[PDB]
């Protein structure tokens, strides 16, 4: 594929810092494009991590599978450290639109087998069914990178 990790085999030290009121789950992209999950982070915490240069991390929500922002972007590729220092990693809530915020609240409050009993319009039924997906986000980023080049 295109988006994957390269076995650079060079050490790097990072600091995962959380400044969002939600739980965070990091996912690391493997050498063939199959993502793998990693332990979670409580809100307002900083954890020291050992990684390699040129790897792919993406940050999601623990239960709602919503996306969050790292370094004000979508991906995170570590770089070699200089001066013997670790590189910070900010996590911040993206400013959602009102439709997406209301969709999240409704999804939380309503069972996933009770949608078609709400008194709403027809399209919102499938909009509520369209759950967030790391696979979909990765796919979108793939053609985004392809069109960029």
């Amino acid at each position: 594929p295109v988006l994957r990790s390269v076995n650079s085999r060079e050490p790097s030290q990072v600091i995962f810092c959380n400044r969002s009121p939600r739980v965070v789950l990091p996912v690391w992209l493997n050498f063939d494009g199959e993502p793998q999950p990693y332990p979670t982070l409580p809100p307002g915490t900083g954890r020291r991590i050992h990684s390699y240069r040129g790897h792919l991390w993406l940050f999601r929500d623990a239960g709602t599978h919503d996306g969050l922002l790292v370094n004000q972007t979508e991906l995170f590729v570590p770089s070699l450290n200089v001066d013997g220092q670790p590189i910070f990693a900010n996590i911040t809530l993206p400013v959602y639109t009102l439709k997406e915020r209301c969709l999240q609240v409704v999804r939380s409050l309503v069972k996933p087998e009770n949608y078609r009993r709400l008194d709403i319009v027809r399209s919102l039924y499938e909009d509520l069914e369209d759950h967030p997906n790391v696979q979909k986000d990765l796919e979108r980023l793939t053609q985004e990178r392809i069109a960029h080049q």
Partner: peptide, 9 residues
């Protein structure tokens, strides 16, 4: 929530 979703749409 439902009214807000309708108004946002």
């Amino acid at each position: 929530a439902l009214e807000l979703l309708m108004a946002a749409n």
